[PDB]
Amino acid sequence: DKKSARIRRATRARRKLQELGATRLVVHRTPRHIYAQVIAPNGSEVLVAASTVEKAIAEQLKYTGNKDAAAAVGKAVAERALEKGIKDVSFDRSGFQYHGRVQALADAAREAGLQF
Amino acid sequence: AKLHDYYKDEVVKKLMTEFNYNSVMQVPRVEKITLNMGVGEAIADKKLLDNAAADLAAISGQKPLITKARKSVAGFKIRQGYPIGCKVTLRGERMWEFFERLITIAVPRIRDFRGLSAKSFDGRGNYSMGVREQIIFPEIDYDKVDRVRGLDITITTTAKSDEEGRALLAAFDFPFRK
Amino acid sequence: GIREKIKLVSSAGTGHFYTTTKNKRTKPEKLELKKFDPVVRQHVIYKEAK
Amino acid sequence: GGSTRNGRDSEAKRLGVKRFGGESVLAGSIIVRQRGTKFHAGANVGCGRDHTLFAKADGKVKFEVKGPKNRKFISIEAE
Amino acid sequence: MLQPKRTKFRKMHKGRNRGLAQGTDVSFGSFGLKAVGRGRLTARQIEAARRAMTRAVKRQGKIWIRVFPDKPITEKPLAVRMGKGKGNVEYWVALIQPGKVLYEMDGVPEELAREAFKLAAAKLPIKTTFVTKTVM
RNA sequence: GCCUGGCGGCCGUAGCGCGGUGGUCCCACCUGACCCCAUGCCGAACUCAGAAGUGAAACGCCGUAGCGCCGAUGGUAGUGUGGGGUCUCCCCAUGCGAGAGUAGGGAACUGCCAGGC
RNA sequence: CAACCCGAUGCAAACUGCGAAUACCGGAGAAUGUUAUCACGGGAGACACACGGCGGGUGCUAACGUCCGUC
RNA sequence: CCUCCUAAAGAGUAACGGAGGAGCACGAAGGUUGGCUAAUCCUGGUCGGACAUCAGGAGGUUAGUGCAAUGGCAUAAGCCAGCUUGACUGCGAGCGUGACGGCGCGAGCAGGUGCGAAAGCAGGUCAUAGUGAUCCGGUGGUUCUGAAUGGAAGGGCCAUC
Ligand SMILES: [Mg+2]
Ligand SMILES: [Mg+2]
Ligand SMILES: [Mg+2]
Ligand SMILES: [Mg+2]
Ligand SMILES: [Mg+2]
Ligand SMILES: [Mg+2]
Ligand SMILES: [Mg+2]
Ligand SMILES: [Mg+2]
């Protein structure tokens, strides 16, 4: 399963993030969508979230997962996780080669204000 | 994709009824030709390897992958590394275009070909037959080559059974033997 | 053995140097790799290595 | 005749069984030649070259068993 | 005339027994010999008994040997000082304990099997007895 | 509450097999590929722009106990202190008491966020 | 002639998909114990042990044998 | 000197007890980033047969690990590649282990490196063998000392043979 492979790729840093116990910003990707969420250290409860699967964002969006489209997703979780008083977090490309959409959005949340 | 379209057209449906399939997304699709040609030898010459490669580089529009050993525990010789082959699978377009290249001009350019194996298949439903000798087909020149050639070719289809493997190719122009 | 000792000298005028071994029997190329020079308290290019 | 010889002491074992005073970095377990026998977890980690279960910040020792496939794992919560 | 074809090690420690074996009841024939006593068979005894066993049943029936030597057991030469390296494997013993199942018969009348294992225990250190198949 | 995805708890009574099953929500394949990026050959994988189609594969469910796995009560082995018989072994008092096997269990349970009905 | 595999049966100091007693380490508590404990300093002697019990190597599960652990 | 058993489930224990190894090797076989994952069997394939390369299926750490054995390893330590020099200098909370000399583990701090988008990782190698105290000298550095004074010889200190 091509999925089972991507998992182990991130199972590494995903453990490193645990090691430091830092609020990580997970970012799952899919052919038709781009998700995002800032889970707490305990890795059980998520503090914030913003994915293209939400009308509010989808509307203003042309096509879900179009880079410039998979960007606002980040800019969203960014402020969304800032008005929450959240800042300075760790990014977890969750196995996704930091280069495409995941590469973006990160700069979005980065530019938006998020510290990472 | 010339033959590629034919699949979606004549084929697919032919199987959809003959094999009575329920979903068009089931019909045994053609999953890339592989091509290998385990030249081997090397030691003696070592240059015939890149030769068998350049030859494949012609037979196919892609770049040959001069493979190495693996077990090393070979009577012949071989020590972990050491060149010994050049698989070179097929790429979608080039693949079908190839499936066209042969069966229409390769298999046709015989030596005495009086039928093709109807059991070169596997258990899953994939066929793989050796040409016995490179028919000199559209390769870097003809009478300009070297000591024979020969090689192997495998289709490998999503066929859930060797039987279904027969349907495929059969819907195409696989000469076969009957 | 066959592993002679080498003395990586600093490119700087400082007489500081590092020590290690090398197998000149197969690695004739004089080794260099840059290290820290305590004297100048700044990294630099160390040389000398059979 | 050949038969004889043998290594020396080479202690290696648990020197901080269960909760302890756990100073800035006692040992908790120096059972070298391991990673799974004792895994670096919690406030404690390190796991020096010789696979020695470090043990950071002062506190008590836990000695647990988590994650897929047994896996001992040691750590030092607060006291 | 029955020893292991291979052994990862040449010598085994002296050690000792602790009664009660595992092969309590028969599970191949329907009779066989029982332990009753703790000991060890020089492997040569098990064969010496087997021969007497076989050559009595004439041929009829089948036989089994749930016991095996596998144990080295060394010996030190005569006129030779002490403590100078472990002795040399002279024979092979088969550690057995009470309840141990030595042999087993089936294709032969119990009247024979019985009067056959007797002509066997005659060539054995441990005091054995007779046993049946038993439904359980 | 029904279904789905992301992240964890706990790690086999949570797994495997076999049968059934879900869809253009989600996911999956899937399309296209000059390009971003990628192939020691391949757009297979990674990567991007995205139809048309289908749940086929995978995945997720549901059922099923054939293979795992959990697993007593009782008895058995061992053993600490005290005593006893004794050829290297064992017995008694009294605390602790397995392993295997049997009865049986068993086709996971559970939290956070999000999206569909 | 036979390995591999399958079911039924055993063996292991240098086998373990299980697993005690128990020793040991740490925490809390009562009682008892002329501090039994730890540290430093003046004086030492002693580094040939022996037997018996238990767990063992070795020896022949021989020796008022031999080499360890422990009482 | 290292490994396993002996060794009675902490450490440690003896024998002219039972079995093996070390006196090195690597400028990459170190560092980091990125990616990969076997052995073996079955089946089907030009020369390819017991045993090369290829395709699938079963299989699942039975492979591999620079060299013994034990423990470990998939987040791989196992494998491939890019770029590199942290096999850096000064220190070091706190521990482990020794009669001692001494040996080992070590987060964190200061200066400068490297690799990465980043979190972060790197003070040599998966770890445990690969070793020789002192003295007497050799070499480089240093304005420490230098027998009336200025130098110098010599001495000290640091690096090293
Ligand atoms: Mg003990
Ligand atoms: Mg003395
Ligand atoms: Mg003495
Ligand atoms: Mg004594
Ligand atoms: Mg005596
Ligand atoms: Mg011990
Ligand atoms: Mg073959
Ligand atoms: Mg090593």
Swiss-Prot record, chain B:
Its quaternary organisation is: Part of the 50S ribosomal subunit; part of the 5S rRNA/L5/L18/L25 subcomplex. Contacts the 5S rRNA; cross-links to the P site tRNA. Forms a bridge to the 30S subunit in the 70S ribosome, contacting protein S13 and S19.
Family to which this protein belongs? Belongs to the universal ribosomal protein uL5 family.
Q: What is this protein called?
A: Large ribosomal subunit protein uL5
Question: NCBIfam families, from UniProt?
Answer: PRK00010.1
Show the InterPro entries listed in the entry: Ribosomal_uL5 (IPR002132), Ribosomal_uL5_bac-type (IPR020930), Ribosomal_uL5_C (IPR031309), Ribosomal_uL5_CS (IPR020929), Ribosomal_uL5_dom_sf (IPR022803), Ribosomal_uL5_N (IPR031310)
Biological-process GO terms, alphabetical: cytoplasmic translation; ribosomal large subunit assembly; translation
Which HAMAP family does this chain map to? Answer: Ribosomal_uL5_B
The UniProt function text for this chain reads: This is one of the proteins that bind and probably mediate the attachment of the 5S RNA into the large ribosomal subunit, where it forms part of the central protuberance. Its 5S rRNA binding is significantly enhanced in the presence of L18. In the 70S ribosome in the initiation state was modeled to contact protein S13 of the 30S subunit (bridge B1b), connecting the 2 subunits; the protein-protein contacts between S13 and L5 in B1b change in the model with bound EF-G implicating this bridge in subunit movement. In the two 3.5 A resolved ribosome structures the contacts between L5, S13 and S19 are different, confirming the dynamic nature of this interaction.
From Swiss-Prot, chain C:
Keywords recorded for this protein, A-Z: Methylation, Ribonucleoprotein, Ribosomal protein, RNA-binding, tRNA-binding
The record ties this protein, via Pfam families, to: Ribosomal_L33 (PF00471)
Question: SUPFAM superfamilies recorded for this chain?
Answer: Zn-binding ribosomal proteins (SSF57829)
Q: Which GO terms describe its biological process?
A: cytoplasmic translation; response to antibiotic; ribosomal large subunit assembly
**GO cellular component labels:** cytoplasm; cytosol; cytosolic large ribosomal subunit
Which HAMAP family would you find in this protein's record?
Ribosomal_bL33
Name of the protein this chain belongs to: Large ribosomal subunit protein bL33
Q: Which organism is it from?
A: Escherichia coli (strain K12)
From Swiss-Prot, chain D:
List the residue ranges of the region (Disordered): 1-14
**GO BP:** assembly of large subunit precursor of preribosome; cytoplasmic translation; cytosolic ribosome assembly; positive regulation of ribosome biogenesis; regulation of cell growth; ribosomal large subunit assembly
User: Does the record's keyword annotation contain tRNA-binding?
Assistant: yes
Keyword set for this entry?
Ribonucleoprotein, Ribosomal protein, RNA-binding, rRNA-binding, tRNA-binding
Q: Which InterPro entries match?
A: Ribosomal_bL27 (IPR001684), Ribosomal_bL27_CS (IPR018261)
Q: Which GO terms describe its molecular function?
A: ribosome binding; rRNA binding; structural constituent of ribosome; tRNA binding
Q: Which SUPFAM superfamilies match?
A: Ribosomal L27 protein-like
Q: One Pfam match, by short name?
A: Ribosomal_L27
Alphabetical GO CC annotations of the entry are: cytoplasm; cytosolic large ribosomal subunit
The entry's family comment says:
Belongs to the bacterial ribosomal protein bL27 family.
- Subunit structure of this chain's protein: Part of the 50S ribosomal subunit. Cross-links to the 23S rRNA. Cross-links to the A and P site tRNAs.
Q: What is this protein called?
A: Large ribosomal subunit protein bL27
- Which gene does this sequence derive from? rpmA
Curated annotation (Swiss-Prot), chain E:
Residue positions where (3R)-3-hydroxyarginine is found in the record: R81
Which residues are recorded with the post-translational modification N-methylmethionine?
A: M1
The superkingdom listed in its UniProt entry is Bacteria
Q: What is one term from the GO cellular component aspect held by the record? A: cytosolic large ribosomal subunit
Single GO BP term:
ribosomal large subunit assembly
Q: How is it modified after translation?
A: Is hydroxylated on Arg-81 by RoxA. The modification is nearly suppressed when E.coli is grown in anoxia.
The molecular function GO annotations come to: rRNA binding; structural constituent of ribosome; tRNA binding
**Gene3D superfamilies recorded:** Ribosomal protein L10e/L16
Q: What are the protein's UniProt keywords?
A: Hydroxylation, Methylation, Ribonucleoprotein, Ribosomal protein, RNA-binding, rRNA-binding, tRNA-binding
InterPro entries tied to this protein: Ribosomal_uL16, Ribosomal_uL16_bact-type, Ribosomal_uL16_CS, Ribosomal_uL16_dom, Ribosomal_uL16_sf
Sorted alphabetically, which Pfam families does this protein's record hold?
A: Ribosomal_L16
PANTHER family to which the protein is assigned, alphabetical: 50S/60S RIBOSOMAL PROTEIN L16, LARGE RIBOSOMAL SUBUNIT PROTEIN UL16M
Assembly description: Part of the 50S ribosomal subunit. Cross-links to the A and P site tRNAs. Interacts with assembly factor DarP(YjgA).
Q: Which family does it belong to?
A: Belongs to the universal ribosomal protein uL16 family.
What role is this protein assigned?
Answer: Binds directly to 23S ribosomal RNA and is located at the A site of the peptidyltransferase center. It contacts the A and P site tRNAs. One of the last ribosomal proteins to be assembled in the 50S subunit. The simultaneous presence of uL16 and bL36 probably triggers ObgE's GTPase activity and eventual dissociation from the mature 50S ribosmal subunit. It has an essential role in subunit assembly.
Full protein name: Large ribosomal subunit protein uL16
Organism expressing this protein natively:
Escherichia coli (strain K12)
- Report which gene this protein is encoded by: rplP
